[PDB]
C-alpha cells in the first residue's frame, strides 16, 4: 500500500495527495520514514494550503519516530521557510510542529525567531484562528526581550486581543505577557495602565462552566500568590454562592483569605460564620483554617477568631478541635505569650487527639509552656507508651519536646530522657533518628550550660505568610501557567 500511497501522492487532485500523506504519517514502522522522505518533499512544496498543511502535520508526526535523518532536518528547514506561507493554517500547523519537536530536546530546539520572524508571527496572529494563535503564543513564550522597544511594541500588538476563543487564547496571551513583565513597575506608565487593564478580563472568566471556573481559579490563586497587587479590592465579587461545586468553594475561600484587608474584617467574619454552618467536613476544616489565617492577618481578627475557635472547642466536634489546635499552635508561634489560659482547656480536651499532627502540636505546646503546666509531664509520659508505629514525625516532635522540657526542668525528667534516648539508639531503623539520639546523648552528657545556649534560644515570628509556595517553583510555573502543571501545583520534573 506504501507504493499505492506514493502513487496517490502523485495524484493531480490535492485531496488524495493529502489523504495519502496523512495516512502514511500515522503508521509507525521502521521503514515508513525513509520511504516517505522522498514523496513528502514535494508535498510541503505544493500549490495548495490543504496539501502543505497536511504535509506539515506529517513532518511533525515523522520526526517523532525513528527520524533523526539529515533529510528530516531538511524537512525542518523547509518547514521553517514555510513559516512564510500564505495560509494561516499551514503556518499554524508548521509552528505547532516546530513547538512539538522543540519538546524533543537535544538543546537545539525551535531553531528560529528574530525581529523579522516576530513581525511575521504578529501578522499570522492577525490572520490566523484559535489554534494557530495559541501556537504562536506558546512558541513566543520562548523569546528573550533584548530591550523595551520590541517589548513595548509587541505588548500593544497583543493587548487588544480579548478574542473569540477567549479562555485559551486570552490566557495564553496572559502567559506571554506575564513572562515579559521585566520592566520596572513605574516606567513610562504603560505598566500602570496595563495593571488597570488586567482586572476586567480576569473578572470575565468566572462566568463559564464550573470546570473552566476551577481552572481559571487555580490560575488566579497562583498569580495572587505571585502578585497580590492587581485585584486589590475586588474581594466582593468572588463571594461563594450557595450552589457552586465544592472545590470552587474551597479555593474561593483560599483567595478570600488572600485578599482580606483592614476594611474586610467584618465582612470576612460574617462570611466565615455562615460558611462554618455547612456540613461538609473538608469545608468546615478549611473554613476554620481560614478563620485562623484571618486571625494571623490582623490583631482584632486575631482576638475575635480566638474567641470563635474557643466556642468551636466547646462545640466538642473532634476534628475541628484538632484543626483549631494546629491553628492556635501557629498563632502562638506568631503571637506568643498572650493566650496561655486556653492551654488548660486544651489539656481538658486532650483526650480528643486521634491525628498524629495534632498530637505533635500538643506535644510541642506542652513542651513550650512547661513552666505553665505541672501536669503535662505525666501526660507525655503516658504518650511514651508508643515508641514504634507512631509515625517518625511524632517521634521527632516528642524527642525534641522532651529534651527541651528536661533542659528547663531536669529534676523529674532524668530517667525519662535516658530511657527515650536508649530506645532511640537501640531500636531506630531510622538512620537520622539514631543520629539525633546520639547527638542529644553526647549533648546532655556534655553540659546543660551549652544546651540551653542552643536549645532554649527564642525563635523568630512568621509575619502573615499563610499557605505560600516556594519561589523558584512558582517562577517555573510562570513558564507554564496554561497547562496541567499549574493546576497540579507540581513541576514536570516529577512527571515525564
Amino acid at each position: 500500500a506504501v507504493n499505492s500511497f506514493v502513487k496517490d501522492c502523485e495524484d493531480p487532485n490535492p485531496l488524495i495527495r493529502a489523504l495519502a500523506v496523512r495516512t502514511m504519517g500515522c503508521i509507525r514502522v521502521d521503514k515508513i520514514t525513509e520511504y516517505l522522505c522522498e514523496p513528502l518533499r514535494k508535498c510541503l512544496k505544493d500549490e495548495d494550503p490543504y496539501v502543505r498543511k497536511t504535509a506539515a502535520v506529517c513532518v511533525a508526526k515523522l520526526h517523532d519516530i525513528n527520524a533523526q535523518m539529515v533529510e528530516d532536518q531538511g524537512f525542518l528547514d523547509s518547514l521553517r521557510d514555510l513559516i512564510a506561507d500564505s495560509n494561516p493554517m499551514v503556518v499554524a500547523n508548521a509552528v505547532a510542529a516546530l513547538s512539538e519537536i522543540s519538546e524533543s530536546h537535544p538543546n537545539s530546539n525551535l531553531l528560529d525567531l528574530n525581529p523579522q520572524n516576530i513581525n511575521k508571527l504578529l501578522t499570522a496572529l492577525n490572520e490566523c484562528t484559535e489554534w494557530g494563535q495559541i501556537f504562536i503564543l506558546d512558541c513566543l513564550s520562548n523569546y528573550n526581550p533584548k530591550d523595551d522597544r520590541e517589548a513595548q511594541s509587541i505588548c500593544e500588538r497583543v493587548t487588544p486581543r480579548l478574542s473569540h476563543a477567549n479562555s485559551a487564547v486570552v490566557l495564553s496571551a496572559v502567559k506571554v505577557l506575564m513572562k515579559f513583565l521585566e520592566l520596572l513597575p513605574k516606567d513610562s506608565d504603560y505598566y500602570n495602565m496595563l495593571l488597570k487593564k488586567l482586572a476586567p478580563p480576569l473578572v470575565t472568566l468566572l462566568s463559564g462552566e464550573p470546570e473552566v471556573q476551577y481552572v481559571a481559579l487555580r490560575n488566579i490563586n497562583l498569580i495572587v500568590q505571585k502578585r497580590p497587587e492587581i485585584l486589590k479590592q475586588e474581594i466582593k465579587v468572588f463571594f461563594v454562592k450557595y450552589n457552586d461545586p465544592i472545590y470552587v468553594k474551597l479555593e474561593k475561600l483560599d483567595i478570600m483569605i488572600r485578599l482580606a484587608s483592614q476594611a474586610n474584617i467584618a465582612q470576612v467574619l460574617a462570611e466565615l460564620k455562615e460558611y462554618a454552618t455547612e456540613v461538609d467536613v473538608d469545608f468546615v476544616r478549611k473554613a476554620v483554617r481560614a478563620i485562623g489565617r484571618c486571625a494571623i492577618k490582623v490583631e482584632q481578627s486575631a482576638e475575635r477568631c480566638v474567641s470563635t475557635l474557643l466556642d468551636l472547642i466547646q462545640t466538642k466536634v473532634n476534628y475541628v478541635v484538632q484543626e483549631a489546635i494546629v491553628v492556635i499552635r501557629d498563632i502562638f508561634r506568631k503571637y506568643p505569650n498572650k493566650y496561655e489560659s486556653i492551654i488548660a482547656t486544651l489539656c481538658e480536651n486532650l483526650d480528643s487527639l486521634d491525628e498524629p499532627d495534632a498530637r505533635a502540636a500538643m506535644i510541642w505546646i506542652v513542651g513550650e509552656y512547661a513552666e505553665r503546666i505541672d501536669n503535662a509531664d505525666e501526660l507525655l509520659e503516658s504518650f511514651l507508651e508508643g515508641f514504634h508505629d507512631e509515625s517518625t514525625q511524632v517521634q521527632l516532635t516528642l524527642l525534641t519536646a522532651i529534651v527541651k522540657l528536661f533542659l528547663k526542668k531536669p529534676s523529674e525528667t532524668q530517667e525519662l530522657v535516658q530511657q527515650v534516648l536508649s530506645l532511640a539508639t537501640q531500636d531506630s531503623d531510622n538512620p537520622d533518628l539514631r543520629d539525633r539520639g546520639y547527638i542529644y546523648w553526647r549533648l546532655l552528657s556534655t553540659d546543660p550550660v551549652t544546651a540551653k545556649e542552643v536549645v532554649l534560644s527564642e525563635k523568630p515570628l512568621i509575619s502573615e505568610e499563610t499557605d505560600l509556595i516556594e519561589p523558584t517553583l512558582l517562577d517555573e510555573l510562570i513558564c507554564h501557567i496554561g497547562s496541567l502543571a499549574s493546576v497540579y501545583h507540581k513541576p514536570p520534573n516529577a512527571f515525564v
Partner: protein, 600 residues
Amino acid sequence: GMRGLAVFISDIRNCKSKEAEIKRINKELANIRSKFKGDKALDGYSKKKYVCKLLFIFLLGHDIDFGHMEAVNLLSSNRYTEKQIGYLFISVLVNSNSELIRLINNAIKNDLASRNPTFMGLALHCIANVGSREMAEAFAGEIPKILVAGDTMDSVKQSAALCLLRLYRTSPDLVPMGDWTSRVVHLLNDQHLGVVTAATSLITTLAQKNPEEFKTSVSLAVSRLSRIVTSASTDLQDYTYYFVPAPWLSVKLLRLLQCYPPPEDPAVRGRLTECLETILNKAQEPPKSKKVQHSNAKNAVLFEAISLIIHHDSEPNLLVRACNQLGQFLQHRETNLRYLALESMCTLASSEFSHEAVKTHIETVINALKTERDVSVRQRAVDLLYAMCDRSNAQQIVAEMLSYLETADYSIREEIVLKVAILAEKYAVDYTWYVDTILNLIRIAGDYVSEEVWYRVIQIVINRDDVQGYAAKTVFEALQAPACHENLVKVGGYILGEFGNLIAGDPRSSPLIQFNLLHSKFHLCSVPTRALLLSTYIKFVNLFPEVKATIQDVLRSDSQLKNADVELQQRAVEYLRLSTVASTDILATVLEEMPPFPER
C-alpha cells in the same frame, strides 16, 4: 401456585431511580408492620406471602427488623412450605439473640425425631449453614447416633456427615473420638456415591488431622480406585458426566491418600502403580467426547494423580514421564491446561529426581513468561524461579527479572522489587554487586521502592566497612544525572554526608562540588528531605570547615530562619548556634562517626 410474591416483585422491581423505590418500600414497610403488629396474623398464605416479601426486600438491599417470633412460628408448623420459608428466614437472618437460639434448638430437636428426608434435612441444613454454640452442643453425640451403626436415607446420611464435618471445623475441640470410626471406614465401600463423597470429606479432614484412627481404610479405598478406574462404559451413568466415570471421587481419594506415608502393603502399591499407568494409557488415546468437559475431567484426574505421586514420591521414571507430559502441556493450545501445567511444574520443581528436567526447562519457563501476554503466568514463573534460586541462578534470575521489571505494568513492579531486595540479601556474594543491583532497580523504578529497603542497605553499608568508599564513589557518580529522583537525594545525601572525608580528595568530588550538588538538589525536596539535608550539611561542617563560610551563609537565609515549620526552624537554630561556638571540641565530640547499625 402462588401469585402475590410475583406481583410484589414485579411492582417494586419495575421502579424508576432509587428515590421512588425508597418511597415505595417505605409505604410497604408501613403496610407490613400494620399487617404484623395489630391485624389478624393468618396462618398459610397471608403470613407466608408477607415473610416471602420481607425476605425479597432484605435481599434486595434493605433490612427487616420485626417478625422474628412470627418467623419462628413458621418453624412450628405442619406444612412443608411454611417450615421451609421459616428455615429460610432463620438461616439468612441471624441476629444477636438467646431466646431465638433456644426456640430454634427446641424446634430442631423436635423435628429431628422424624423419619423423612425433608425434616432432618432441613434441620441439618440449618445447623450446617449457620451454626451456633448450644445448637452444636445439643447434637455432639446425637449426629454420631445417626452415623454409627445406623443406616438412614442416603441423602440424610450425606447431610449428617457434612453437618458433622462443618461442626468439627467450627468446634474441633467439642467433637468426641468415640468408637464410631469402624462404620465410617466400613461405609466407604457403599454403592451410593454421594454417601461415599460425604464420608470421604469427613475422613479426609479427620485423618489428615488424626492419622492413627483411619489407617484401616487404605486398602479398601485403593480397591475402590481400582474398580472405579475401569468399571464399564455404562456403570452408574447416574454418576457419570460426559463419558467420564466419577472424576471427583478419584481426585478426592487421591487427595485422601496424601495424609499417610507411602503404603506398606505391596498389593496396594502394585495396584496403585498399575492404575496410574492405566490412567496414563487412556490419556494416550484421543478423547472419546469432543466436548471439552471430557478432557477437563480426565486431566483433573491425571493432575490429582500427579499430586499424589509428587507428595508420596514412589517412582523416578514415573516422575520424569509426568514432567514430560506437563512440559507437553506447557505449550498446549488450551490456556487453562497451560495454567494448571505450569502450576504443577512449580510443584514438581521440588522433585529432586525431575528437578534436573525442570532446570532444563527453565528456558521454556522464561519463554512462556515472555510470550504469555497474560500477566499471571509471569509472576507464577517468578515464584518458580524463587523456588529454584541458588547463587548462579540468583545471578541470571535477577538479570532476566530486572528486564521483566522494566517490562512490568504498575505493581508487580513494586513487590517483585521487594523480592529482589530480599533475594539479594539472601544471596549476596560480592556486596558491590548488591549495591549495584539496588541502584539499578532504584534507577528503573524509583517511585515504588520502599522506606525500609534503603534502611537495610544503609545498615549493610555501615556494617561492611570496606565497600563504603566504593559505595560513596558510585553514589556521587550516579547523582550527576540530569533527571534526579527525590529518594536518590536522601540516600546520596546521607551516604556522602557521612563519608565525605574519603571522597573529597578528588577535585571532581571536592567538598565544594559535593555541597554544590547538594544545594542544587536542595530545591527538589520534601520537608523531611531538607531536614535531613540540614543534618548532612552540619555533619559536613564537621567534615570540612573549609566550606563553612559558604555553609554558614546558606542556612542564614530568611526562608529557613523565619520558616513556617516548627522542626525546620528548630534545626536551623540548633545548627546555627552550634556553628556559632564551633569550639571543635564539642563539634567533633557530639558529631561522632556513628557506631555501625546492629542487625534487627
